[PDB]
Write a protein that binds this ligand. Structure first.
Ligand SMILES: O=C(O)[C@@H](O)[C@H](O)[C@@H](O)C(=O)O
Ligand SMILES: [Mg+2]
Ligand SMILES: [Mg+2]
Ligand SMILES: [Mg+2]
Ligand SMILES: [Mg+2]
Lengths: 386, 386
């Protein structure tokens, strides 16, 4: 058996050309950042992970190295299940908060343990998880068309992503619902019925404006309505779902652990659970959430948006899961999606395949890592919701 | 009008002699720690606060100075309501997590803004809040008799607090329910019916063991059963409450914002909301939670346990609130209760009075602060629940 010797958190920042910054309810993007988690062992088998973002990099680094890390040093990394609970009950729930950046931190470490396990076994993570369900590949969507566009421009951008091979894409909404509606109408007219259009309000709407928008989304045949409301308003989501439209009510990037999703399910408040393996507790926790969605006859389609590691970690699980595929793929300017690792976007008939190597299944460019150390740059401007 | 110039977070640690270290489901106490928040203005009016604990001090310091702080610099501190929302929607909810150490961090800053406001106005916080309801003083309880005692020892400790003037005290339970039961029985026999006995399991029990223990709490006429279960199991709390006993089901030190408590209320799952002004969002947020409890014909009795600032902040609110008083007073070894400030425990006929000075109502001993800089010591050993 191996023993964990170090838990490291590398803070990384990559720039965004001013014109390529995009804004949603989450704020105006400034620099694409991440923590690259590195778990080392006595025999030199290493796993890597990411706790997603945007979350302050110093907060993440401290939580990972100095709160979670000490619970892992000296432990057999093979006992991922034991270690999840040791960390959650020993430190994170009480001492970082039960639905928190500490849970995202745990997630990054958990992903690294799964990567380590796959590397030790010389198997891709999806093989450990029972192998593929989606044997031919996983249907992806282009994430996302952001604010600050006219309707013709939104339609142009959608048509562009479709030309690149995407069969689905997402639109950010929430600031100016009349403009959002005009954008959606133009988008649908441009591409026709065979392209799925998803909408994401980043918690920007109140209940009544969300009900008004849902009518529009229904008219436009939208696939889902993501974060239509504050994630704190469970009943509001039930109200939207109770309208009985074919538009799925989706949320989950900002909800943590299976406990959050259980509360939504018990209140008939969710169609699509979007728990991200890199945020909601780890691969370990996302597995449980995906299963719980299926038990309730609901869907799990994770949020994946931060870096190529968060994408890859979720993709292993999605490939292995019988849930209908609607796999988030960040198409915005992001060096962490292109230059961090050897795994790249490749669409065939609208589908992507999980990485095929051991663990997460690709190689990290450590020269790139060394050249992009964080120097205190901000990731994102102030969010909305006031 | 003033302008905020600096938001500082002083990391402090104070030791606990070996024999004085107590253990509960939250862990074995090692050092009593805090962040002392200091908000400065251009005209030299300063407010202080605390975001409670245990939470990692470096995580807190970074969140306060470098995540929350930048949203405050240059702002008029008088607009506490505006600033709460600027911070929550701008940064904390999404970028630190909606039920998180970030919320505790916000709470410390919010308390400091209220302290600053009171100092600027030359009024105690309770006067701003509409003045006293509890004009004669606030009934307190001794917090707490911890694990590791025999029944005779538990009864003697309780009798000791009664001799000191307390009309109520709390017992920690959950590791060995048969011993817990024996302790309670001995305690009740010793003091008779006129002393309130509270019980706190620190999330240690599952549903069936909690139902079994509730029968014994009922037999012993206990006032409340605090954190009987994981705070993530709302339905389990409903089950306990549905037994219809005179024992109140209490939770809240580990639940964040009014949203958590609304979910408990909507599920008929809570009798006593324990939202702490220094954890759950601030004085601003605790005010709303207290009001919401009253609207639902339930009680708000805050958790207050970390330092004299968290005690004082809650006491101003409790003094002003019509809720029946059951005010938590940390009687364990804690230099942050005795040496940080000029305000101390003064029990008269079982009651305490809020500080009478401006703002929080006492002065900080800055020499003590300077002499107790954190040097990386841990606050608490691994918690339980696994
Ligand atoms: O000592 C402990 O068990 C905790 O740190 C406290 O917060 C406790 O739950 C309480 O109600 O004051
Ligand atoms: Mg567990
Ligand atoms: Mg989203
Ligand atoms: Mg608000
Ligand atoms: Mg407690």
């Amino acid at each position: 058996s191996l023993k964990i010797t170090e838990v490291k958190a590398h803070a990384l920042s990559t720039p965004i050309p001013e014109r390529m910054r995009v804004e949603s309810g989450a704020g105006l993007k400034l620099n694409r950042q991440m923590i690259l988690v590195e778990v080392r062992t006595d025999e030199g088998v290493t796993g890597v992970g990411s706790p997603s973002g945007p979350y302050d990099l110093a907060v993440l680094k401290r939580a990972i190295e100095d709160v979670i890390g000490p619970q892992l040093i000296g432990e057999d990394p093979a006992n991922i299940n034991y270690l999840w609970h040791k960390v959650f009950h020993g430190e994170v729930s009480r001492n970082l908060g039960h639905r928190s950046v500490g849970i995202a931190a745990m997630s990054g470490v958990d992903i690294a343990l799964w990567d380590l396990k796959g590397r030790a076994m010389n198997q891709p993570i999806y093989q450990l998880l029972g192998g593929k369900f989606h044997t031919r590949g996983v249907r992806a969507y282009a994430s996302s068309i952001y604010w600050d566009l006219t309707p013709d421009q939104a339609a142009d951008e959608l048509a562009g992503w479709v030309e690149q091979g995407f069969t689905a894409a997402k639109l950010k909404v929430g600031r100016a619902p009349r403009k959002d509606a005009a954008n959606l109408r133009a988008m649908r007219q441009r591409v026709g019925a065979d392209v799925e259009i998803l909408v994401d309000a980043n918690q920007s709407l109140g209940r009544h404006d969300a009900l008004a928008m849902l009518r529009i989304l229904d008219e436009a045949g939208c696939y889902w309505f993501e974060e239509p409301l504050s994630i704190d308003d469970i009943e509001g989501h039930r109200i939207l779902r109770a309208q009985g439209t074919p538009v799925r009510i989706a949320t989950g990037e900002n909800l943590y652990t299976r406990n959050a999703f259980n509360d939504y399910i018990r209140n008939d408040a969710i169609d699509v659970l979007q728990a991200d393996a890199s945020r909601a507790g780890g691969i370990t926790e996302a597995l449980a959430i995906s299963a719980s969605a299926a038990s309730a006859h609901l869907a799990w389609n994770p949020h994946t948006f931060n870096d190529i590691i968060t994408v890859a970690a979720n993709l292993h699980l999605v490939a292995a899961s019988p849930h209908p595929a609607m796999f988030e793929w960040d198409i915005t300017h992001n060096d962490l999606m292109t230059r961090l690792a050897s795994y790249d976007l490749k669409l065939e008939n609208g589908l992507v395949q999980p990485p095929q190597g051991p663990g997460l299944g690709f190689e990290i460019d450590w020269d790139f890592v060394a050249a992009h150390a964080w120097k205190g740059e901000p990731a994102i401007g102030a969010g909305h919701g006031m």
